[PDB]
Give the backbone structure.
Amino acid sequence: KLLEHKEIDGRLKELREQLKELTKQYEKSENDLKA
Amino acid sequence: TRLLDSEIKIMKSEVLRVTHELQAMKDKIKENSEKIKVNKTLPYLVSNVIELLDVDPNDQEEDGANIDLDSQRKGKCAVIKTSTRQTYFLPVIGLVDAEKLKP
Amino acid sequence: MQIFVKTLTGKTITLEVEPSDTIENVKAKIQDKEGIPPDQQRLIFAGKQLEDGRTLSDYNIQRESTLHLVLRLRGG
Amino acid sequence: MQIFVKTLTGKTITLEVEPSDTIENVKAKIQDKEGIPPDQQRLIFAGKQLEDGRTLSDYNIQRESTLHLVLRLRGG
Amino acid sequence: ALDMTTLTIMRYLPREVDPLVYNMSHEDPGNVSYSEIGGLSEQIRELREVIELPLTNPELFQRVGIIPPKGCLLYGPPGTGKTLLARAVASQLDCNF
Amino acid sequence: AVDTAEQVYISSLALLKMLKHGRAGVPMEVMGLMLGEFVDDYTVRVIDVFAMPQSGTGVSVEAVDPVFQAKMLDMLKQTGRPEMVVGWYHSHPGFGCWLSGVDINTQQSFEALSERAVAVVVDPIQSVKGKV
Amino acid sequence: CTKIINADSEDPKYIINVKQFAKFVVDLSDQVAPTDIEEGMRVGVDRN
Ligand SMILES: Nc1ncnc2c1ncn2[C@@H]1O[C@H](COP(=O)(O)OP(=O)(O)OP(=O)(O)O)[C@@H](O)[C@H]1O
Ligand SMILES: [Mg+2]
């Protein structure tokens, strides 16, 4: 039987959690540099 | 029937794309950060905040030749007085949040 | 009122919606559920695909009608 | 396999590539052929400006198709 | 505002608010009331008749045919409440002060 | 090797276009691109010019997006004028004429794509009734 | 010649005053120890 995705989805979810917050760190930094 | 294993092609193609992309952004926020560090340097004039002001764009704001500073910033703008007794307008404040500045 | 959704993974979901909600809005709500980007999403009603600018009510989707949700690779 | 690119000078360039090649790998090959900094060069095809992480495969590109290369431009 | 390399006009601006007058305009935590000032209940009315009424009901004086006074001074020995009166008026009259 | 005799030929139309565009952006340093042909290794002709859209920094400008020029460079060939691009220009109002420390950088890649490239500069407020 | 005002703590930055030019935020050189620089004393400062 096939259930493959679940565990890797959790991994992707942690990555999502990182990636989204990392974009915040990006945006503010660029909002400084552009000034 | 057991069907539509396409998820796996969905899955791994996501995993790689995300994993590298995050790392690349991690690098750039690193690099751009040191860029900021070099603007600060050390000698700084001291001055007093005279004002805190709030202005809105022109009625028409074409692209072409247009200045991304004298218009189209949503935040405040400021006026400062230097120790050398000059007055300058600042259409953007810089590295400090206006929410904690007072005349 | 709610629709039902059946995924290729066998997951069943029970989403409260307005029938006047656009399919693109429903896909945005699904992304809100699980981050799944709407471009990857495909919605089928009773073997009919749902147009992005379509509502639900346009074929009168109501009352726990089970849409099939299919995931596809996409890229311009 | 092999692919072409052209630019506003009338110059054409030909690269040995594979569909698995990333856009950043393409940019690297372009610099290896001509030395241009990868951030001043920009690529266009199908009316879409490229991004680094995707690949020739997911860009749906086919044999000997011709990309457009264009340059960053600022005063200062 | 002038561009500092060529001095060509860029924008017009409103007038200054000199920071001393800003700090003068709204700095008062005091909150006393006319219940906290005993024994000069008539001078209070004598002052209120000048600052409060012609600010809000101006046609009466026009009918009688006069213009109200502009100002008054409070005087007397130390410690008789001269600042307390002004604190109370400031706390309990809606205006700019 | 390069020489001391190379000569640049410009048409009237490029002149009027450049003057008008530079004078309109009077407080700031506008941008544009110019096209023509190398008829030989001693002489270069510029035939026509078209403006470009920017977002302006206070000091200077950067070309906002290349899709615009990617369109233009084929949009007009349906009406002749098949020439390729040869250079670019920007205007200094009243400063004089020189290349800044970043203009040089921009010229670097133009030359790296084609070694014959040129840069042009104009002064729209000091030029009077002649001697542009 | 300048007159120091105060010293920001730990890794140090200083405030400088001169009687017609402006005030500044500055630091030291390698040849002066951070001990003998108490606030309220005239010091020597480079010109650039
Ligand atoms: N009539 C009064 N009723 C109540 N408290 C009073 C009265 N007069 C003075 N005080 C008290 O005096 C104290 C402060 O005095 P106040 O600020 O009024 O000084 P002042 O009379 O204006 O003096 P000065 O002329 O030196 O300014 C307070 O504790 C206040 O309660
Ligand atoms: Mg008093």
